[PDB]
Amino acid sequence: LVHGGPCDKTSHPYQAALYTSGHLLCGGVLIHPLWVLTAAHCKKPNLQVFLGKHNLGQQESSQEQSSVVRAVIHPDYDAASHDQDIMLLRLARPAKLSELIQPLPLERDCSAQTTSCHILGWGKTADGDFPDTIQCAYIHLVSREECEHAYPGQITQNMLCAGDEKYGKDSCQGDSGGPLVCGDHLRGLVSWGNIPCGSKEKPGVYTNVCRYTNWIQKTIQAK
Ligand SMILES: COc1cccc(C(=O)Nc2ccc(C(=N)N)cc2)c1O
């Protein structure tokens, strides 16, 4: 995340860190004790999910680790266009909830009224480095018309745009799959956007979570 700052220790209990081959890969969102939501482009072998983390560099009493038993990529995911960039991960070990480990409810209304939005993650910062401490930034949803002009013929109804006109606060590589939180509800997932990261003109592109309500429920309630 570029142009943000360190999060308050107790404000991100839904945040997951996704690892592959012992290295941070993506962010994720805890949505149920057994399920983490992330982007489909975060699919890698033998993912390890870390919950209740703040600083990646140290062992924290609040942390919980789990391997993934099932990875469910949306059937209509299209890698080239990032369309329908969403995946559900079933945890081997259900999340032991605490003040620092809690699920985030989903936004179900695609026409939800404007609320304060924020993004968070351990992705690439302004200096080009990966932070040990989780970063946060307040951002705003961008009108679909403005986003379509920014990315001609690339924005589908399964995507939502967000950014910041003042400093260009934006999500980046490593934040992928992490949450776009609006009014204490999951509104989007970090998917793609401007490279180098910065949202002053080309806003960040997020998977539009409200479109996936039925698919998420059907996957979680399957078998
Ligand atoms: C495993 O996932 C990845 C691997 C390599 C690169 C990326 C990446 O560049 N993502 C990305 C780019 C721009 C934005 C933005 N809003 N400006 C957000 C995310 C990646 O996600």
Structural overview:
The protein is mainly β and 223 residues long. It folds into two domains: 1-12 and 104-210, no CATH class; 13-103 and 211-223, Thrombin, subunit H (Beta Barrel). Helix content is 7%, strand content 34%. The protein has two helices and 13 strands. The protein has helices at residues 144-150, 213-220, and strands at 5-6, 15-20, 23-32, 35-38, 48-51, 64-73, 87-91, 117-121, 135-142, 159-163, 179-182, 185-192, 204-208. A six-stranded antiparallel barrel has the order 8-9-10-13-12-11. The longest helix is centred in the last third of the chain and has 8 residues, at 213-220. The chain binds ~{N}-(4-carbamimidoylphenyl)-3-methoxy-2-oxidanyl-benzamide (J2W). ~{N}-(4-carbamimidoylphenyl)-3-methoxy-2-oxidanyl-benzamide (J2W) binds next to strand 3 and strand 12. Belongs to the peptidase S1 family. Kallikrein subfamily. Keywords: Autocatalytic cleavage, Cleavage on pair of basic residues, Cytoplasm, Disulfide bond, Endoplasmic reticulum, Glycoprotein, Hydrolase, Microsome, Mitochondrion, Nucleus, Protease, Secreted, Serine protease, Signal, Zymogen. Residues 1-221 form the Peptidase S1 domain. One of its GO terms (molecular function) is serine-type endopeptidase activity.
In short:
The chain is mainly β and 223 residues long.
Q: Would you spell out the secondary-structure blueprint of this structure?
A:
Layout: E1 5-6, E2 15-20, E3 23-32, E4 35-38, E5 48-51, E6 64-73, E7 87-91, E8 117-121, E9 135-142, H1 144-150, E10 159-163, E11 179-182, E12 185-192, E13 204-208, H2 213-220
Antiparallel strand pairs: 1-9, 2-3, 2-5, 3-4, 4-7, 5-6, 6-7, 8-9, 8-11, 9-10, 10-13, 11-12, 12-13
EC number: 3.4.21.-
Active site: 41 (charge relay system), 85 (charge relay system), 176 (charge relay system)
Protein name: Kallikrein-6
